[PDB]
Each structure stands twice: as structure tokens, then as C-alpha cells.
Amino acid sequence: GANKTVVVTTILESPYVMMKKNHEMLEGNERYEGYCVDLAAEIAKHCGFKYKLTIVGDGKYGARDADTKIWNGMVGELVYGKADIAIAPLTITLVREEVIDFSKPFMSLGISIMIKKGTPIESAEDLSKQTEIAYGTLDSGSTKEFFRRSKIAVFDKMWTYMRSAEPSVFVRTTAEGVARVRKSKGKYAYLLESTMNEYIEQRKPCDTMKVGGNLDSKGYGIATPKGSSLGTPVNLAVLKLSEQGVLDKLKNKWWYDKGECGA
Amino acid sequence: GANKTVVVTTILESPYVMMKKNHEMLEGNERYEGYCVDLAAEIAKHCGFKYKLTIVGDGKYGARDADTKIWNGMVGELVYGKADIAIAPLTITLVREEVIDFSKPFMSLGISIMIKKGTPIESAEDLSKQTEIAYGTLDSGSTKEFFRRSKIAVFDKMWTYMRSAEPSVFVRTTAEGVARVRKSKGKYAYLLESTMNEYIEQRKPCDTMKVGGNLDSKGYGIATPKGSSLGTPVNLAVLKLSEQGVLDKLKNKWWYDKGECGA
Numbered sequence A, B: 001g002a003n004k005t006v007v008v009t010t011i012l013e014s015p016y017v018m019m020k021k022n023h024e025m026l027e028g029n030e031r032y033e034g035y036c037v038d039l040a041a042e043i044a045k046h047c048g049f050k051y052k053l054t055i056v057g058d059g060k061y062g063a064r065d066a067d068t069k070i071w072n073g074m075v076g077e078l079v080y081g082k083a084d085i086a087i088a089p090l091t092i093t094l095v096r097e098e099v100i101d102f103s104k105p106f107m108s109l110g111i112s113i114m115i116k117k118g119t120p121i122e123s124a125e126d127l128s129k130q131t132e133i134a135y136g137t138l139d140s141g142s143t144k145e146f147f148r149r150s151k152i153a154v155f156d157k158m159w160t161y162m163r164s165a166e167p168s169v170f171v172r173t174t175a176e177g178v179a180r181v182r183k184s185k186g187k188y189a190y191l192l193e194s195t196m197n198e199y200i201e202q203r204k205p206c207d208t209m210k211v212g213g214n215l216d217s218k219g220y221g222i223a224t225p226k227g228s229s230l231g232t233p234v235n236l237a238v239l240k241l242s243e244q245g246v247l248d249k250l251k252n253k254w255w256y257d258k259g260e261c262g263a
């Protein structure tokens, strides 16, 4: 039919979407800033639609409950028609690509290790061969699923430890996992996406480090309900923005230019 | 209808598709080896189709002639229905994504600089600020198009030089550009994709080097004619292979394990 204001689902995750400090003075899309706030503005311009940013109610990326088969998070908001598009650091996975459409990826990432500086760990293999330092992942996301499914020996060894560890090694939010690394005196390491890991390393108090190579190679995509009319224009817009240098400019804006830990 | 043997278009490009040395003893798909030979076998298995590898007649990736609007290369083979699928290091671009379907990317790359070891160049900026050392790209591909379209100052400066340079800085095949770097005593630098650059650096005579960071961020996709029934199963297969670790294993097989220049 006639063009309608598009409901965008997204998630509070630095530096993608962040509440402006004075947000209670502000209304609508003006409450928020970040890489995905900027990317939403670009996508909507290039597709000629009006839109409203909404933070996912349950604060989750998206996983399907094994008993109910109900999708939660941003994936769930698309699946049940509560949002028209998800513009967020939402990982392209086979289990999701089957229930939602994903654009070509707008950013690459791989799973990585965050340590408190000085922690005697340089790799996933190192983590797996010891017990002094606990380690975990975010709940309700692609990292946790990577470990759960992995048939690779070292990651399977890691998963077997993590699923049964006490107290729990899993966290609800990235901020929580970061707080735990910062406050555990080197006795907790966090497995999170390289992109997030990199942003945090350049933020005060400058007490974390990314170590080792990435565990996998993947991407974030703009997601739409399966068969949405938005899917095609959205994908073309991501490719156009890539080719125009805009994605690179936005990455520099929200990563390099936001660096607080020196050169 | 009933399932038919799929015609695969591909291109002789190391280490993706390479003639086996004894190929005149061999027939059909057995003539060829490489990353994309292996990837084709995996894709066809996961999609349950039989297939025939064919080398693109004109030896080109795909560009559209500005006067005729006729597509050449592997893109042209898809557009005119001479091939059912292209399984090759074929770059996802907006001009192509509009005439063919691309899978989610199976490998990432960026444009990069190849020099003869000892060449006093470390970046694109360095190349642009001098004239002693000539530099160019492959014809009929995404690298040449990147420079031609770029609105970025340094790349526009590079393009202005390259388009008018004499003798021509452009080459028909990657092997030709590599030969020119090797035989020009440091007076020619070649702009090519990081993936290819990396493979060549680890091959005898070990006389080239990749320098500087990548100029862009993009990917190779499996391409199909627009609206092909193969598009969906092919994409799911790429995601499944990614998640299974197969793409990483194949990268190690054809890059790291093929290294001839030491550690």
C-alpha cells in the first residue's frame, strides 16, 4: 500500500546505540546516538522512508526457546511483526536467516577474547587448558550459540566447562561482562565480538585488552521480516553506502575518533 | 522442473581454480583444483545437484560496456544464461547485485598494494605522491571500477594518473600484473585484492610484499541469474559451511598450507 512510518528495533549496545546523557530532555529518535543511529538515518534516506527508533523490550539479540520455539529479542520482534526492520549489531546466522531476511553485511566481526590487562592468557587454547580464570559469554546471542554447537575440539572443551561452571559465567548484557572482567582482578575473561572488544579497549579506564586471533569470521546484517518489501531496497542501500565510503567513515567516527586511551 | 546438471562458470585464478599439471590426462571437473573447486563440491553436495566446471571463455570477471551495455566475463555468462551459477572470487558490487543474485559472502577482502620487496612505498598515499613507480590494476573488474568511481581525494588522484599513464598500467590477468611487479625492478606496484596478494606473497620466488592497510572492505559471493531457484539453497549452504568451519579449513588448505616462503 501507501508508505508508512517504519518501526526500527535496535538494542542499547556501545557504540552502536547509546542514550544521550540529556535524553530526558529529548524526544523520539533524538534520544539516541551512535553508529546504528547514523546508519538508520542513511538507510531511511536512501530508501525514502520515515522511521521510529525503538529499543527492544527484553534487551536481547535473539534466540529461540528449545521447548516453546518462541523467538525472543530483536529476532522475535521481527518474527511476530512488532518491528518492520532491525538495525543493530545483529549477527548473520543460519538459524536466524531462515526466519528473517538479512542484508549483505555492513560490518565484519569475529568472536574474540577480552582480558583485564596483565591476565596470563593469549588465546582460546590457553583458556581451555586452565581453570584459575573463569570465562563466559553473553546470553541469548550468536557467541553462546557458536560454543554450544561447535564440533571443534578446543571450543567444545570450552563449552563443556562454561555450561556447567559455578557460579554462572554467562551475562545478560555486554556491560555486565565488561564490568566482570574489570572487577575480577584477572580471574574472569569475556568472549565477545571483536567490534565491541575493540571499542571497549579504547575507552577509560583503559584496563582491558583484546588477545589472540578471532575465533570465526562473520558479519552484521540489517534484518527484515521474511518477504518484507524493505529487504531489497535495504540491501541495495547497504551496498551503496559501502561503495560511497560511508560505512568506513561511520566506523572511524564511532571507534577511532572515540578513542580515550591514547594513540 | 526435474533437476538438471548445473553449469558452473569460474575463472583460472590462483589459488581458487588452477589447472592440474597433468590436466591433459584428465577429464571434466578432475582437470581443476583449488579453493573454489573444493567450495563447488561442498555447495553442490549441500544443495544436492550435479555440476560441470567451465572456465569463462573471455577470461574476465565482469564489466558492462558503456556503449553497448553488454556484460562480459562471468557476470555476462550469468546474465545471458550461458551458466547457471558462478563459483569464483567474484566481488559483490552494487552494479552487479542488480543484474545477478549474490550469496552472503564466503570470503572477505579489500583492495591492497603489491610491491617488489625493497620498493620505497608503504601506502596508497605514498603511491599518489610520486611518479617514479608506475602502478595499475586488473581490467574488467571491481578494483578498476573502485578507482574510476572513487570520490575520495587520494584514490581520485590515483585514478587520474592511471587512466592516462603510458605505457598502460592495466593488465588482463593477475599473473600478468604479478609478472610486471617481479620484472620491473621496483618501478611497478600492483593494486589487487588482499586475498590474491596474500597467496602470492607466500609463493616462490618470494619476492613480493603486501604493504599498507586495505583500501576498502568487501566480499566474494556465489552468484546466480536473478530469480534462479538456486539462490536460496546456495546462500543457506554458504552460511552452513561458514558455521561448520569448512570455509576456514579451505582457506588454511589453499593459503597457509601452500606457503613456500617459510613461517
Ligand SMILES: CC(C)S(=O)(=O)NC[C@@H](C)c1ccc(-n2cc(CO)c(C(F)(F)F)n2)cc1
Binding pocket: A092, A104, A105, A106, A107, A108, A109, A217, A218, A219, A220, A238, A239, A242, B092, B093, B104, B105, B106, B107, B108, B109, B217, B218, B219, B220, B239, B242, B247
Ligand atoms: C558489498 C559489501 C557490503 S559486503 O557484503 O562484502 N560486506 C562488507 C564487509 C565489511 C563484510 C565482508 C564479509 C563478511 N563476511 C561474512 C562472512 C560469513 O557470512 C565472511 C567469511 F568470508 F569470513 F566467511 N565474511 C562480513 C562483512
Ligand SMILES: N[C@@H](CCC(=O)O)C(=O)O
Binding pocket: A061, A062, A089, A090, A091, A092, A138, A140, A141, A142, A143, A144, A191, A192, A193
Ligand atoms: N551480535 C550478537 C550478540 C553479541 C554476542 O553474542 O557476542 C548476536 O547477534 O547475537
Ligand SMILES: N[C@@H](CCC(=O)O)C(=O)O
Binding pocket: B061, B062, B089, B090, B091, B092, B138, B140, B141, B142, B143, B144, B191, B192, B193
Ligand atoms: N574479484 C574482482 C577481480 C579482481 C580485481 O578486480 O582486483 C572482481 O570480481 O571483479
